[PDB]
Amino acid sequence: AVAPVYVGGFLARYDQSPDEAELLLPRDVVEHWLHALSVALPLNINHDDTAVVGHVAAMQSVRDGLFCLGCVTSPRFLEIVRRASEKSELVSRGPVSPLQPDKVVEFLSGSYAGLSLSSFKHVALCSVGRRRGTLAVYGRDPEWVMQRFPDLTAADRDGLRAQWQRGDPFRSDSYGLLGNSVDAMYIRERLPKLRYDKQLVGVTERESYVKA
Amino acid sequence: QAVAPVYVGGFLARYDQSLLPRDVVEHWLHAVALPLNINHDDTAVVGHVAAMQSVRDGLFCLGCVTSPRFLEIVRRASEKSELVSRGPVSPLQPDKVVEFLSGSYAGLSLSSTPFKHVALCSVGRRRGTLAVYGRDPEWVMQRFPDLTAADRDGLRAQWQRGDPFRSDSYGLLGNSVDAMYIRERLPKLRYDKQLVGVTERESYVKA
DSSP: SSSSSEEEEEEEOOOOOOOOOTTOOOOHHHHHHHHHHOSEEEETTTTTTBEEEEEEEEEEETEEEEEEEEOOOHHHHHHHHHHHHOOHHHHHHHHHHTTTOOOOHHHHHHHHEEEOOOOOEEEOOOOOOSSOOBBOEHHHHHHHEEEOOOTTTTHHHHHHHHHHTTTOOBOOHHHHHHHHHHHHHOTTTHHHHHHHHHHHGGGGOOOOOOOO | OOOEEEEEEEEEEEEEEEOHHHHHHHIIOOOOOEEEEEEEEETTTEEEEEEEESSSEEEEEEEEEEEEHHHHOOOOOOHTTTHHHTTTSSTTTOOOHHHHHHHHOEEEEEEEOOOOOOEEEESOOSSTTTTTESHHHHHHHHHOOOOOOOHHHHHHHOOOOOOOOOOOOHHHHOOOOOOOOTHHHHHHHHHHHTTTGGGSOSSOOOO
């Protein structure tokens, strides 16, 4: 529905050892980045600057990584998704048992299962993220989405919660989303990577609309 | 440009793939035309099958995507694709529409008067069902080593001798996401390519 959709997830996962054994981004290197939110960080589709769907409501550098909570607010984008979801068999199959069907959230969960902070500038919703653990979790309530991630601390969530609170931007079209999906269809290890990110961030231990 | 018809040919069934029997397809057919649609959606007819020839290895088909509306949607979608922008293999000329069609509807699917239509899908359920697109019928037919000169004259005799697409981009978009979650999609398509020897040819196939 044109009620907004929230999306949360890790943009980057932090190296936990004292010697870079994992080759992940150091927490203080990324925190320098953060330190370096007054200007709105746009949320776009697959890095396309004409395809702004909403914005990042909060970014919190936590123990395991840099978590992000964005808001998909664009009526046009949500309408396109509403229209495409009505023609998807995957969506008609429905979520996992206890969850209430939600065609848009479910369409988004399958189409843009990844998050990507990169060429801050913007956060991109894409079919998969390159960095480890960048799975995108959508839901209607921001509280439910943060609760999908076991890594998050009561304090971490309060850290985010404080930020998110204290003319349609989408200038693209369905064709742009159509072209993206075909490219996505040829990304080779997409599902595997998704499944790996899900486990890593622990959404496998929670009920969600994640299609992977 | 794009709104020039695109031909599509491939096997709808392979008689060696472990059910369409050699004997039956041969007599209703081998011894007015089925519409060609997108993923079995009857409101998504993009053209029609022009010829079907029962041959040594399977049931070969040749269809033509004619809908100016469908082709228009595809041309506009094709320029927003990074895969299409990467172009085909060297000698071949960039054909954004043909390449887009190759990417998204890499498979053919015969629905089974004994069949309702032939469907262009992300992958067909029957193996060996790769969809080979191209601007010239002779060129696509020639993509398949299996086909004999005799078979070709057989198919050829079948062509020589209102916009039906009532769907839209939004529909194609719903389709693409379903395709994204079909698990061994690429593997199946790669197997399909080897099976019909399309690997032994240059083509717009993206798998």
